[PDB]
Amino acid sequence: SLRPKLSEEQQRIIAILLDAHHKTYDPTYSDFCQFRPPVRVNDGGGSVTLELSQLSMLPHLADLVSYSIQKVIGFAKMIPGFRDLTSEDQIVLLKSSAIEVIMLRSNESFTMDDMSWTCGNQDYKYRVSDVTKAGHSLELIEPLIKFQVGLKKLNLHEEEHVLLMAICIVSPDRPGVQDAALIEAIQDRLSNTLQTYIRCRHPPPGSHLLYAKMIQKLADLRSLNEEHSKQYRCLSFQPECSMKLTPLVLEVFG
């Protein structure tokens, strides 16, 4: 069972992606006080009527997601080969993957301590009850939490985490892509880097079938993407919803 060494180029790709992530993911969440403030209405009963009437957490979470899409755009532009694509394909890939990369990158704030995304004091701790206060339902939230725990338990090296985000973005099977072959060539270069990295740098037993497990998470993300889109559609029917979102969020999901 051969373990070819990482090529000079593969090492450079990993370094570039690590740098890109470090430049676009602030692990202190220090910008979050700039978003519209979180508001949490009394909704212990999980009333859909109340949740939609108030959408109390939506301005804050929409601002968080919008900010994150901006960061993902920056990250993607640093992926080796991404700028070889036409502008048209670049935008198709970004719009189609945005929610998935947000779900992946959020794993860094997710904690199994209490099953929350913890981004600071209580104000910026996001629980399932906060997501329902933004107008989403359990059909999305429950599998989202299951996804976060499963990803956590893979214990990815940061190298593997950034590669997975890059592979997710540069996917040739997204609707509307023009040069699928070029996209696939870029993705293959990243996939080969990841497979090679795992085999020579990830110790047992966590390395066992790890590449296959990571590829399965990409398939899981497709499912969550589809469910999020259905739910965003519903959310959009609420009068005055657009003011609680942002122009970038409206474009990406509308």
Ligand SMILES: C=C1/C(=C\C=C2/CCC[C@]3(C)[C@@H]([C@H](C)c4ccc(C(C)(C)O)o4)CC[C@@H]23)C[C@@H](O)C[C@@H]1O
């Ligand atoms: C973003 C990041 C973070 C959390 C992501 C969360 C927690 C709150 C609920 C969110 C935002 C989920 C929620 C279902 C969601 C995603 C997009 C939307 C809207 C409200 C736009 O429909 O709602 C998806 C990702 C979830 C915090 C930090 O890790 C940065 C990361 O980019």
